[model samples]
Structure formats: structure tokens, C-alpha cells
Target: PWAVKPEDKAKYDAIFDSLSPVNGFLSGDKVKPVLLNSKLPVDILGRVWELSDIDHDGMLDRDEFAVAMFLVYCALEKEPVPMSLPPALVPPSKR
Candidate 1:
């Protein structure tokens, strides 16, 4: 969720626009809207939110968007495993 209000659409949009890229640190392809919508857990979101604070403004800026994408990629970059529950609500898979 955005720390700042949606009124900052211009800023957030700008940030999102800049963040969406293939060559950038975010590697855009890795961040799926399906995953971000509800598949990502609150705990995981917290981690990404904290790590992506590039300007430390308490919210995700353009650069931070990349950071978030990077964080998500890094976190999920591992061997495949079975999942009984959906990703967002479930804790990290142990297997």
C-alpha cells in the first residue's frame, strides 16, 4: 500500500513509470501485477517497503519502486517448491 495519499498520483505515477523497466535494478519482468495485487504478504510487503525507501521519505518513490522490484526478485529467487496456500497470506515456503 502507498504510504502517501493517492492524491500524489503524479508523483507516484512518475515513480512507477520510471521503475518499470527491464534493464533497471527492478528487472520489471519479475514483478507481476498479479503477485503485487494480493499474492504478496503483509510481512513481505513490509520488507520491500522498508528496503525501497531510496529517499527515506517514508514512501516509495520512483527509485524505490525499482528497489521494491529488486527486493521481490531477490526474495523469490530460489528453488521451486510446492505451495498449498496462496503466496500473499502464507508464510515463506519452508520446502
Candidate 2:
């Protein structure tokens, strides 16, 4: 029941690697700019982060980042960001 395709996961992992990660995860510092630059409002991006950071660790690892990207894509296509992520969207490892 994986709704996010493999290709998109790879794409997000590549983007995550491109950022300056602190420790093994991306800090809000670099991630903020990329998300903010997207035409979406800051509030929506905040919600995206909230839902995707599965550990609630205040940071994002590759899977979480990928999930964030997926949610952003949905939002861009005029889909309302779910108040909570659907089971299909929860990163497998995080699940």
C-alpha cells in the first residue's frame, strides 16, 4: 500500500543529500530555505514538517524529508494537507 513511488523517494533522498546535514539529519536551517522558496505559505510548510518528522525529534532524516516532499507535491496540486498523515504516507521505517 505504498502510495509514494520508489522514484520519488530516490529523488527526495538526492535532494536531502544536497543539503548541509548536521549529524546524520537535516537541520531546519537549510531545509527552511528550500521549503520556503516553494510558492507555499510558511504555515503550510510548518504543517508539512510537523507531520513528517515522525520521531518529533525537531530534525529530518532522509525518509522524513521524502515524506515532506510528497506532502508538498500533494499540496501543490491543490490537495489539502491532511491534519495527520495517512497510513500510506507514513515512512515505512518510521512506521
Candidate 3:
């Protein structure tokens, strides 16, 4: 039901991989702070999580991750949120 077509998965996965520690994946609990710490909109994370967590579970699967990332990407570009992330958020050693 997401507008993010299937083809977009790979790029989203790359971003997630760059961000996540273990695998290129994230859960609601895991992703929440990452977005928050990245200076994304604090209030909208819950709402975005609500929408992105399609299965209603607490985890953000690949599709959810993509959708959420798109939203965050849009916000990062448009809203007053920081356009750039600090080195602290650049994953463990992928820098």
C-alpha cells in the first residue's frame, strides 16, 4: 500500500545498511532514536512510525524502512531539520 514501488527497495536497503549496525534493517525501537538523534522531526517520528509500521508490530521491515526513510528524507530536505547528519550517525566503520 506504500507509494514506494518495489524497485526502490535496493536504494533504501543501501541507506539502511549504511545506518544499521548489524544488517540493513531496523525496528521501530531501533529506528526511532536513529531518526531522532539524526535531528528528524521528533513529533512526527511517532506518527511516521505509526504509518510505516504497517503490520502494527513494533518492527520496521524493509518496506517500512523504505517508506520511513522516504518520509525522513523529505522532511530533512524541506523542514527545519538538519540537512546533514553528524559522523556519529554514519554507522560503525562504513565511513
Candidate 4:
């Protein structure tokens, strides 16, 4: 089940709004069809559960969940993928 609910509509919107494409696909737009085709890795769900389920209740209060989601969202948004060794380690190469 989702952690956020009606009372948390604004909080949910705020967090979801901040996601880059890699983090999540926002709901209820024409883009839903496109986004639905993409999926996240399983570890992402695990990390979210670890962060927000502080009381061992298997659920999160709105504020707790919002913080948790936002933190994850930021981590994914900021990480660099397809990374290479730092330029300092190698001389310039034409190839």
C-alpha cells in the first residue's frame, strides 16, 4: 500500500514533483502510459521501507514517509551513472 493518503495530498505532490525521470514517473497525466513502461529496481523499494518504517509498524505517518521519499528521491536524482575514471588519472587520448 502507498504510504501517503488524502490528508497528505500536498506532501505527496511536493515530493513527486521533484523526481527526475530516473526516480519516478508522476501519476495522472498523459505521460502515465509512457512512464508505466518503466520500472525501478527492487532495492529502491527496500531502501524506502528501511527509511520510513521507523516504528516497525510497516507503515509511515505522513511526515515520516514524506521525508523518507524525498531523501530517496534526492539520492537517485543526484547520483551519477555511466561514470568513468576521473580525468586526472589518464592523459588525453584520441581514442
Candidate 5:
């Protein structure tokens, strides 16, 4: 549900590009430790994993890596999930 703000593109891209090959995508037992150590509520974490597995193949992709935060950011801004990228409200440096 998270939609990236145009100004945050660079930050978002950094994360999208940083997932290590060893941790590329999770499955079965691999998901255990991540959930165990995640400070997020168990239920919320579960949902995040489910939704982020965009392909429904039971693996989170690079784009889905931080799905929870993306959803939260959109909710906080009261914006709908974007179908296409939007222009920045103002230049990022001006902020």
C-alpha cells in the first residue's frame, strides 16, 4: 500500500538496491529469524510478508523488501497507493 514520494526516490532506491544476495528472498524456515527479531507486532509482520510477496510465489522481491514501511508512509500521508510516480511537491533540497 505504500507509495513512494517523488522526493524520497533516491532513499527508496538505495534500499531497493541494497538487499544482499544471501538474503534475496525468504521461505519456510528462513523467515523465522527475521520475524523473531523484528520489533514489529507478530501479526503485522506476518501481513507485511504476505503482501510483499507480490508474485504470490512465497518470496519477497527487491521492490517488496520494505513493504511495511511503504504502506505506513502512505497511510500517514493519507494518500492512495500510486499507480504511477508523482512529481515531488517541492525540490528535496528546499526541505
Candidate 6:
């Protein structure tokens, strides 16, 4: 499961639902604003998306979008984005 709190995940879910994802996953365009709003530049979020889309399908499901937001949290906390996700960041379904 994601290490984030329930309240935080709820917030993410709301954001996800509001975006009206097609086929149960959001395109890069839809998610880009959410990530960019965090004050991280496009290049950094590009990398964040690269890491979050674990299925490599080029779109994000709810779980993956949450992971992307979690990673964004880390980036804002001043932790460098890891070359890959740590175990805790991996959604339970994927593991």
C-alpha cells in the first residue's frame, strides 16, 4: 500500500476523479498540471511520471497517480528523486 495517510489518498482520489480519466487511467496531459502545480518544473515531473507509470503503459491509474503524488512529496521535501521507487512507494497491487 502507499505510505501516505488516508486523508492524503482521499485528496488524491478526489483530484483523480475530477480529471475524468478515460479507460480508468489518465494521460500525461491530465496529470501534468497536478504535478506541475507543485512548483517542480516540467523536466523533473517528466522523470517523476517515468518512475510512477510502473506498467510502462504511458498512462496512470489511480494507484500510480497516487504514487506520482507521493514522489512529488518527496521531491518537495528536498529528497532527490531516486533512480527508482523504494519498496514503500510501490502500490500493493504491483508488488
List the candidates' TM-scores in order. 0.40, 0.84, 0.59, 0.38, 0.43, 0.80
Model 1 stretches astray by more than 4 angstroms: 1-15, 18-35, 56-58, 79-95
Candidate 4 at residue 53, lDDT? Answer: 33
Q: What is the number of residue pairs that collide in model 2?
A: 0
Best by TM-score: 2
- Give the better candidate number (4 or 5) by TM-score: 5
Question: For residues 1-95, what per-residue lDDT tens digits would candidate 3 score against the true structure?
Answer: 33554566577677556556344347656777756764666766766555555544666666556656655666767743232333332232324
The window of 10 residues in a row where model 5 has the poorest summed lDDT is 85-94
User: How many residue pairs collide in each prediction?
Assistant: 2, 0, 0, 0, 1, 0
Give one digit per residue, the lDDT tens place, for model 5 in 1-95.
23445445555345444433235554424443444344445554455555544544655444444453454344345643333222232123223
Model 6 weakest 10-residue run by lDDT: 79-88
lDDT string for model 1 (1-95, tens) is 34333444454445466545433334323333412653566455556655554533444445455445444444566422222222332222211
Runs of candidate 6 exceeding 4 Å displacement: none
Off by over 4 Å in 5: 6-19, 22-38, 72-95
Runs in model 4 lying further than 4 Å from the true structure: 1-10, 13-39, 79-95
On lDDT, who's better, 5 or 6?
6
Residue 6, model 2: Cα distance from true site in angstroms: 0.5
Clashing pairs in 3: none
lDDT of each: 0.43, 0.74, 0.57, 0.38, 0.43, 0.74
For 17-57, candidate 4 gives per-residue lDDT tens digits of 54422233332232223222224343544454345334324
lDDT of 4 at 63: 38
TM-score computed on alpha carbons, candidate 2? 0.84
Indicate whether candidate 1 or candidate 6 has the larger TM-score: 6
